[PDB]
Scaffold this motif. Structure first.
Motif, mmCIF file in Angstrom:
data_model
loop_
_atom_site.group_PDB
_atom_site.id
_atom_site.type_symbol
_atom_site.label_atom_id
_atom_site.label_comp_id
_atom_site.label_asym_id
_atom_site.label_seq_id
_atom_site.Cartn_x
_atom_site.Cartn_y
_atom_site.Cartn_z
ATOM 1 N N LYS A 110 -50.618 40.674 79.965
ATOM 2 C CA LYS A 110 -50.975 40.661 78.626
ATOM 3 C C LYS A 110 -49.799 40.859 77.828
ATOM 4 O O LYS A 110 -49.863 39.929 76.786
ATOM 5 C CB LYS A 110 -52.125 41.575 78.349
ATOM 6 N N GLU A 231 -59.032 41.102 77.275
ATOM 7 C CA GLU A 231 -58.978 42.418 76.809
ATOM 8 C C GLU A 231 -58.181 43.183 77.991
ATOM 9 O O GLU A 231 -58.463 42.716 79.096
ATOM 10 C CB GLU A 231 -60.414 42.865 77.143
ATOM 11 N N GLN A 232 -57.236 44.042 77.664
ATOM 12 C CA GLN A 232 -56.216 44.504 78.650
ATOM 13 C C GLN A 232 -57.105 45.648 79.457
ATOM 14 O O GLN A 232 -56.624 46.810 79.488
ATOM 15 C CB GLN A 232 -55.004 44.899 78.186
ATOM 16 N N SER A 233 -58.022 45.463 80.164
ATOM 17 C CA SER A 233 -59.108 46.544 80.497
ATOM 18 C C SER A 233 -59.328 46.809 81.862
ATOM 19 O O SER A 233 -59.658 45.814 82.690
ATOM 20 C CB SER A 233 -60.360 46.500 79.854
ATOM 21 N N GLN A 236 -64.265 49.057 82.637
ATOM 22 C CA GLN A 236 -65.330 49.278 81.545
ATOM 23 C C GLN A 236 -66.147 48.290 81.328
ATOM 24 O O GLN A 236 -65.964 47.683 80.490
ATOM 25 C CB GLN A 236 -64.153 49.594 80.402
ATOM 26 N N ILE A 239 -68.120 47.529 77.835
ATOM 27 C CA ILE A 239 -67.165 46.711 76.852
ATOM 28 C C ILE A 239 -68.023 45.437 76.421
ATOM 29 O O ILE A 239 -68.366 45.541 75.272
ATOM 30 C CB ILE A 239 -65.795 46.166 77.337
ATOM 31 N N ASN A 243 -69.658 47.580 73.370
ATOM 32 C CA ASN A 243 -68.470 47.599 72.386
ATOM 33 C C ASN A 243 -68.600 46.144 71.777
ATOM 34 O O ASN A 243 -68.318 46.324 70.256
ATOM 35 C CB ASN A 243 -67.146 47.827 72.807
ATOM 36 N N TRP A 244 -68.767 44.952 72.196
ATOM 37 C CA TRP A 244 -68.841 43.769 71.440
ATOM 38 C C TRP A 244 -70.249 43.490 71.121
ATOM 39 O O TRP A 244 -70.579 42.735 70.325
ATOM 40 C CB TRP A 244 -68.537 42.687 72.873
HETATM 41 O O1 LIG Z 1 -56.716 44.983 73.097
HETATM 42 C C1 LIG Z 1 -58.002 45.573 73.702
HETATM 43 C C2 LIG Z 1 -57.545 46.703 74.971
HETATM 44 O O2 LIG Z 1 -57.314 47.831 74.555
HETATM 45 C C3 LIG Z 1 -57.966 48.605 75.078
HETATM 46 C C4 LIG Z 1 -57.115 49.609 75.529
HETATM 47 O O3 LIG Z 1 -57.587 50.891 76.374
HETATM 48 O O4 LIG Z 1 -59.100 49.595 74.272
HETATM 49 C C5 LIG Z 1 -59.952 48.438 73.440
HETATM 50 O O5 LIG Z 1 -61.145 48.716 73.943
HETATM 51 C C6 LIG Z 1 -62.490 48.260 73.155
HETATM 52 C C7 LIG Z 1 -62.687 46.551 73.205
HETATM 53 O O6 LIG Z 1 -61.744 46.076 74.076
HETATM 54 C C8 LIG Z 1 -62.217 48.565 71.718
HETATM 55 O O7 LIG Z 1 -63.310 48.893 71.033
HETATM 56 C C9 LIG Z 1 -61.075 49.540 71.462
HETATM 57 O O8 LIG Z 1 -60.930 49.758 70.041
HETATM 58 C C10 LIG Z 1 -59.675 48.997 71.971
HETATM 59 O O9 LIG Z 1 -58.593 49.902 71.801
HETATM 60 C C11 LIG Z 1 -58.733 47.971 76.144
HETATM 61 O O10 LIG Z 1 -60.148 48.601 76.513
HETATM 62 C C12 LIG Z 1 -58.642 46.648 75.973
HETATM 63 O O11 LIG Z 1 -58.400 45.894 77.194
#
Ligand SMILES: OC[C@H]1O[C@@](CO)(O[C@H]2O[C@H](CO)[C@@H](O)[C@H](O)[C@H]2O)[C@@H](O)[C@@H]1O
Ligand SMILES: OC[C@H]1O[C@@](CO)(O[C@H]2O[C@H](CO)[C@@H](O)[C@H](O)[C@H]2O)[C@@H](O)[C@@H]1O
Ligand SMILES: [Zn+2]
Lengths: 320, 57
Positions: A110, A231-233, A236, A239, A243-244
């Motif tokens: 990412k 999403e760098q996730s 979770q 999400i 969240n979305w």
């Molecule tokens: O750019 C998204 C990236 O940031 C992370 C870092 O832990 O956190 C996000 O998670 C939620 C949606 O992706 C958001 O609501 C939150 O504000 C955002 O910081 C990762 O979850 C995600 O990959």
């Protein structure tokens, strides 16, 4: 009386093993038809069968793995993973290392590797130019960009020099390895393969409402884990649905070892109607494909997986 | 006839059988200390009992 149970426990584990092995044996032609039927009866099913035929294997191709292993900066990657490991003192002598690896591939991809492409940049103009781009809509691939796995090119007009820039949508992950940009489609495609090139156990998970991601089996967490590269996730699954706040219907995952319905992992509210296919059918469908898929494996590999299967099922329905 | 197992037990039952065989006895134990009707099939023949179990999966 005073029953005492290991005498009886043990008896069970044993008859259970055989039970399981019987299931994953004979491709009994009663099903061969019921299956064959469904793939013409309902087209959704047909959809996933087709998806399995692609996804469940394309990524297990060792030429690709090595191309990517050349191409990524394995130095920088491991360097970091080792930094972030040294910080940890989690569990004594444990598989947690491979988790860090994922997490680092996650950030590498990412932050450094790959680009998100909303509208393309104008190749004639400068580099950071993409609103003085207005969409002219789509067209078939120029033949040259059919060399790769492209069935459609979104095309853009630049409003500053008035030149066409094209954005072809490719499925060849190696091609992506050069263009280095796309949307979730490309994002997930390549990142799935990146992961498999480390021989991690990976799944490609398709959500019917135009989004895709992947699942990786963390051994240290002892279960599938949600990884989205866009999403760098890491881990979770909520999400999307919370969240979305995204409405979702079916979520299903394809991996070399099986095709399984992973909805209840993800669709934890905003639940659309399921009804492209009868529930019992969809179950069967997978189980059947999973079987076909596992057809040529030794007896104890088979068991060992069918267990990891039921582990998941219990995690899904009990939805911890 | 049919087992008659609680949705929660029948679940954890098939959980531990597949995930933690070591603890399957003490489960099998307590599960019996709780279903009188079943404890019978156990006392008067573990075999019938276990076959019944495999019906749930
Ligand atoms: O750019 C998204 C990236 O940031 C992370 C870092 O832990 O956190 C996000 O998670 C939620 C949606 O992706 C958001 O609501 C939150 O504000 C955002 O910081 C990762 O979850 C995600 O990959
Ligand atoms: O929103 C669904 C759709 O949009 C994408 C890309 O346009 O992601 C966007 O939406 C998220 C919130 O709704 C943001 O967190 C994300 O950063 C933003 O790009 C796709 O990921 C998705 O398919
Ligand atoms: Zn321009």
């Amino acid at each position: 009386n005073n029953i005492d149970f290991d005498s009886i426990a043990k008896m069970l584990l044993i008859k259970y093993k055989d039970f399981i092995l019987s299931k994953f044996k004979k491709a009994a032609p009663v099903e061969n038809i019921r299956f064959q039927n469904l793939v013409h009866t309902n087209q959704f099913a047909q959809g996933v069968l087709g998806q399995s035929q692609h996804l469940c294997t394309v990524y297990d191709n060792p030429s690709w793995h090595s191309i990517v292993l050349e191409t990524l900066d394995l130095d920088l990657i491991y360097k970091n993973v080792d930094k972030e490991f040294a910080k940890d003192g989690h569990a004594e002598g444990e598989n947690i290392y491979t988790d860090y690896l994922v997490k680092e591939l996650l950030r590498y991809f990412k932050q450094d590797f790959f680009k998100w492409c909303n509208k393309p940049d104008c190749n004639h103009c400068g580099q950071n130019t993409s609103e003085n781009m207005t969409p002219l809509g789509s067209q078939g691939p120029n033949g040259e960009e059919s060399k790769f796995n492209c069935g459609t090119v979104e095309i853009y007009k630049c409003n500053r020099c008035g030149n066409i820039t094209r954005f072809p949508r490719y499925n060849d992950p190696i091609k992506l390895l050069e263009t280095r940009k796309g949307r979730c489609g490309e994002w997930c495609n390549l990142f799935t393969l990146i992961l498999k090139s480390f021989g991690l156990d990976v799944r490609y998970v398709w959500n019917r409402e135009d989004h895709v991601w992947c699942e990786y089996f963390s051994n240290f967490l002892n279960r599938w884990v949600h990884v989205d590269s866009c999403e760098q996730s890491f881990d979770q699954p909520y999400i999307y649905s919370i969240n979305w706040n995204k409405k979702m219907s079916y979520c299903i995952a394809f991996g070399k070892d099986g095709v399984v319905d992973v909805s209840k992992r993800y669709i934890l509210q905003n639940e659309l109607p399921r009804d492209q296919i009868k529930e019992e059918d969809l179950k069967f469908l997978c189980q059947f494909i999973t079987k076909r898929l596992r057809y040529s494996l030794n007896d104890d590999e088979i068991y060992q997986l069918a267990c990891r299967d039921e582990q998941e099922q219990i995690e899904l329905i009990r939805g911890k | 006839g049919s087992i008659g197992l609680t949705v929660e037990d029948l679940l954890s039952l098939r959980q531990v059988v597949s995930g933690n065989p070591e603890a399957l006895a003490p489960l099998l134990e307590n599960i019996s200390a709780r279903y009188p009707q079943l404890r019978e099939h156990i006392m008067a023949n573990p075999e019938v009992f276990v076959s019944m179990l495999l019906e749930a999966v």
